[PDB]
Amino acid sequence: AQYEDGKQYTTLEKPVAGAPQVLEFFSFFCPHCYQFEEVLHISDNVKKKLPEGVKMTKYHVNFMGGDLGKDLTQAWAVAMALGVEDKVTVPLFEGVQKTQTIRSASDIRDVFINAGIKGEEYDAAWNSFVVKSLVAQQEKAAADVQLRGVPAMFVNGKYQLNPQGMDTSNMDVFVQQYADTVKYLSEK
Ligand SMILES: O=C(O)Cc1coc2cc(Oc3ccccc3)ccc12
């Protein structure tokens, strides 16, 4: 077949019931994730190839970056609780990987302050049980598949994208193959 298990995707040996239709995992320490955001815009290109209104979910992971990796998962929970993902994703990626000005939870907070989130409202979210539960939700989603690599995308709790099997000579061709594979998997 044109799409084959082991080529563009792999199939989870234990499928996960109740998962979101499209689920992405990333780390602000992950270099391919940085590219997926700034250069390839993978999430937006996948969204444009799926029907209107499909749910897409994106979670941060703990396993890169030690203490700060976990702080970043909590900060991503804050961003999701406050609905400010689009305001903080690029400055968090650049603060970690480009300028290397993010070295502490305080430096993370500065990114949110600079993006116009009020200090009081950041701190209230950071300490909230709603955010504690969003941290648990991110960890649980990752744990369901003993995730050890990002960027990762799962479709319908069943299929895992395999970008290792896609053309990397051309960035736009790669994005198109990735998104068309997601579309194919979502129609399975
Ligand atoms: O770990 C792997 O090999 C799989 C993988 C995940 O995200 C990626 C992003 C890439 O970025 C490019 C660069 C130039 C053209 C097209 C794509 C390349 C490969 C991968």
Rounded Cα distance between 55 and 110, Å, is: 30
Are 138 and 73 a contacting pair, CB within 8 Å?
yes
Rounded Cα distance between 47 and 186, Å, is: 12
Burial class (CB in 10 A: 0-12, 13-18, 19+), 143: exposed
Strand order in the sheet with 56-60: 9-11, 159-161, 152-155, 22-26, 56-60
Method: X-ray
Q: How many CA atoms lie within 13 A of 89 on its CB side?
A: 19
Rounded Cα distance between 171 and 156, Å, is: 26
Domains annotated for the chain, with CATH where assigned, are 1-188 (3.40.30.10)
Ligand 1 closest atom vs CA 149 = 1
Determine the residue type at 152: A
Residue 163 CA to ligand 1 centre (angstroms): 7
Residue in 172, 147, 171 with CA at minimum distance from that of residue 161: 147
- Is 7's C-beta closer than 6 angstroms to any atom of ligand 1? no
**Which are the contacts of 121, defined by CB distance < 8 A and separation ≥ 6?**
82
Rounded Cα distance between 143 and 126, Å, is: 23
* The pair of three-digit structure tokens given for residue 169, joined into one six-digit string: 């000579």
The pairing of strands 56-60 and 22-26 is parallel
Pocket test for ligand 1, best of 161, 174, 175, 181 (most atoms within 8 A of CB): 174
- Is 174's C-beta closer than 6 angstroms to any atom of ligand 1? yes
Q: How many CA atoms lie within 13 A of 31 on its CB side?
A: 1
Q: Three-class SS of residue 15?
A: coil
Rounded Cα distance between 104 and 122, Å, is: 15
77-98 burial: b if 16+ Cβ within 10 Å, else e: bbbbbbebeebbbebbbbbbbe
- Is 35's C-beta closer than 6 angstroms to any atom of ligand 1? yes
